Design a binder for these strands. Structure first.
Ligand SMILES: [Mg+2]
Lengths: 95, 106, 96, 82, 95, 106, 87, 96
DNA sequence: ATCAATATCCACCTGCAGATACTACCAAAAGTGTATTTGGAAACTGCTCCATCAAAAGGCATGTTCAGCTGATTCAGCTGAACATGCCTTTTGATGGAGCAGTTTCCAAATACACTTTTGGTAGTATCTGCAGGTGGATATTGAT
DNA sequence: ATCAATATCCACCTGCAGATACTACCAAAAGTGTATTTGGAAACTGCTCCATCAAAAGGCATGTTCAGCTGAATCAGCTGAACATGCCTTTTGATGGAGCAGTTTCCAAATACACTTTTGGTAGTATCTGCAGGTGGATATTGAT
């Protein structure tokens, strides 16, 4: 009966943004879900630790950013960080 | 009324991300920008993977991405490979590679 | 009355299997080995089908990756035949 | 014909994995050694997998149990939940 | 002027229990302090995920116990569970 | 007044261990026996390693335990060694060990 | 503030003698000539990794001073946990 | 004139160095290397003495452990001499 | 080389398991509005310990000389690959029911808070002591022979 | 063996800096006592999906044959160790100043409700298609001659 939350729909939207005529198997979707959860945890975990080191009660985007820098290889980090900063600005330049 | 995702230009669910942060015990408090930044990052990485598995499905005359496609997309990409270097993709197989010394006398 | 030379088939096998992703252990023998081993920690246990599938993907990936390293240890020794020592050396260096 | 479960992991099957691993030629002593190696792998994972199960006061090993065991063994597996 | 906490005094007690005529250098002590901290985090962390996995919002002596079982090897696990159970028992009964 | 440690017959600080379990946000609530158990476990582990290092201090005619003794302790012991498989003891040194083939004669 | 001498080629400060001592503690008997440069290269990669993370911790704490804690956290991240420095 | 045979002083050295715990790289040289590398990441940095010290302990420990692995790799290949393909083999197997 | 035996590959057909699509639908996150709380940037400043410097105390760089190790060469033997032969274990599918997982219940045990008491850390000033570093003098290892 | 040069050992012996002490203090613990909230075991139960058996589906086990790989033996070139020699750079102890870290003030931003709006998940059912598994003959790779 219970709800089974998953990033499947969002993965799909993004997929459609990038490969509009392309589909994805049940199992490939599962993997993609696993991957977002994984990456979510790694990042969130690292930011968790960051605040604790600095005796801060709050996880801000500053912590998310630093986390991303620690976790991602050179260029993947670079892009991610801009992507993040962008989305934050675009949200702040919004009423 | 508009969603935070759209407020930010995202497909990935800010509110959800926001929730998962709190109910995850990462800190007592979670700022406003954190779920946005995070969600942006998760979207981006998803894009990057699908992007390349997309190509890899194409490069093998297919239009459905199965796991193999993800595996090729990851293991042929140096940085994705590092980031997932300790992860196993189910039903993904290995890259075609044979040590040269095993190749017959040409 | 035709015969392939030692090795030629071996490669043919390699390309075929590096091409594919099917599991290469047979599901039943595998499932029994799980339950046999599982028994040692708790008696009368029931396994979800997918849990036994997880353990297979896990295991085979691990062994295939172990074989690559084993292979490199054989080649390091100026051989092409993998032997138990190669495995022991791979394992020692990985920290197992 | 009686035969140990471990011997159920057959020479061809072992051989097939090695092949996917790019292995060309195989000492006949390998197959036993491989079985020892796989046993220790499963032993390690299942122990933890079960420890989870048992903790849940359950009688069934869920895929989650396994996935979480692999994760902590540093053998994260994508695809079966988590 | 904020104080820094350490398990030094307790480490020193237990050293006297096992080796009454034996000293500990401050470097060695620092190492010991590191080890308690490290093992503390490792177990608490294993317990955190345990609770989460099972959708429980409490870390009880039972989550510690399993954490210990996942974390420690063989004879240390056995012994640690003993010592741990023994102390709960004796504490429960003390109140 | 009686410390929770003395109620539990522990040398290790159950108050602290509680305070620390809360502050590290490992979960919403932390049960009452949780710090007791874990303080016990820690106390034990430290006794076990103090024990073997003490021995190593003794075997090298020394009264005071220094890092080499914890190193000797830990690395000569299957289990602690495993527990500290990925840990570096500062000033520890290594176990004296030389490989057969490298010794003179035959 | 007035000057600080340009820093270059300091990897060469990891001399042949010291590399050889490390190798002895590592139980090594004979050493090929090429090893010394390989080791320098290998150490350098090691240090770049650790310092990069340490420095990230430092910057994040808005500090100009790299602390033992910074280094200790960085080593942990990389599964080279270090006892004895605030670990 | 007296002369120890090649290998004999080496073993003396091994015994000597496995017996002690002192850092084997010189402090100052090592410190500048840390500062060089750090400086190339961020300029105008300072270091707690213990930070360099931590770094040095972490590094000598990493290298020594790598020299054992390297040694085993030479000995797998039936040599007693370590060379870069051994180091390189140890690092791949480890996954670095 | 060619010939032929065997393997791979690419063009075409199609059934259906897997994936897409829809809409009822409906609880449960998510968004919005207002009242309440507190976290951590700021401006100021005490105080530590970092960078920097001269003094003095060891270790590295370099060349030479050759022991002995690596790798090349040859090679004889057993060991693993290829492939014949029938032969028994695995896979696939249907079928009650075990047990996980849904749901409500109510209480032991949790958080919350306020006041009292104790303890653990430091700081200033103290005398105590394990042992590192030195001495010389006794015994063992090593390598020429 | 036979000898001797050099390393190894150890036992005794001050010098001290590292550890252990104590007294005096106090801030922040930690304990303690009601007050109030709720997470989760416990009891009850619907329904997956897991065990299991029976029909159908092919591979793995064994033995014979020998190609060619591994390892042994020999070896000469030449690389890496040992050691003398020349000599500079690291270490270590002392002295202002940058920056970190400890206050304290305070508002901008997060949490806490509570109440309205939707979205995402299920599922039921219908509907659709990408490709897996054939086919056929076309071509490619290997090995005998
Ligand atoms: Mg530079």
């Amino acid at each position: 009966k219970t709800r089974k939350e998953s990033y499947a729909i969002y993965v799909y939207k993004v997929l459609k943004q990038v490969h509009p005529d392309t589909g994805i198997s049940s199992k490939a979707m599962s993997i993609m879900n696993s991957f977002v959860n994984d990456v979510f945890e790694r990042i969130a975990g690292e930011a968790s630790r960051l605040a604790h080191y600095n005796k801060r009660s709050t996880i801000t985007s500053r912590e998310i950013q630093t986390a991303v820098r620690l976790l991602l290889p050179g260029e993947l980090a670079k892009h991610a960080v801009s992507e993040g900063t962008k989305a934050v600005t675009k949200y702040t330049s919004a009423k | 009324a508009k969603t935070r995702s759209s407020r930010a230009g995202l497909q990935f669910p800010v509110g959800r991300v926001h929730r998962l942060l709190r109910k995850g015990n990462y800190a007592e408090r979670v700022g406003a920008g954190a779920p946005v930044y995070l969600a942006a990052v998760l979207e981006y990485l998803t894009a990057e993977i699908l992007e390349l598995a997309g190509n890899a499905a194409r490069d093998n005359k297919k239009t459905r991405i199965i796991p193999r496609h993800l595996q090729l997309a990851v293991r042929n990409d140096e940085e994705l490979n590092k980031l997932l270097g300790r992860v196993t993709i189910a039903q993904g197989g290995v890259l075609p590679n044979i040590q040269s010394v095993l190749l017959p006398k040409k | 009355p035709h015969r392939y030379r030692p090795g030629t088939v071996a490669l043919r096998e390699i390309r075929r299997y590096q091409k594919s992703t099917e599991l290469l252990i047979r599901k039943l023998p595998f499932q029994r080995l799980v339950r046999e081993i599982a028994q040692d920690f708790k008696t009368d246990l029931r396994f979800q089908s997918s849990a036994v599938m997880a353990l297979q993907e896990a295991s085979e990936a691990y062994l295939v990756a172990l074989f690559e390293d084993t292979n490199l240890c054989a080649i390091h020794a100026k051989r092409v035949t993998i032997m138990p020592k190669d495995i022991q050396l791979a394992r020692r260096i990985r920290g197992e | 014909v009686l035969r140990d479960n471990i011997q159920g992991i057959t020479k061809p099957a072992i051989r097939r994995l090695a092949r996917r691993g790019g292995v060309k030629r195989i000492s006949g002593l390998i197959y036993e050694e491989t079985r020892g190696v796989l046993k220790v792998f499963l032993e390690n994972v299942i122990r933890d997998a079960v420890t989870y199960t048992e903790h849940a006061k359950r009688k069934t090993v869920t895929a989650m149990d396994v996935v979480y065991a692999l994760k902590r063994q540093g053998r994260t597996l994508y695809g079966f939940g988590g």
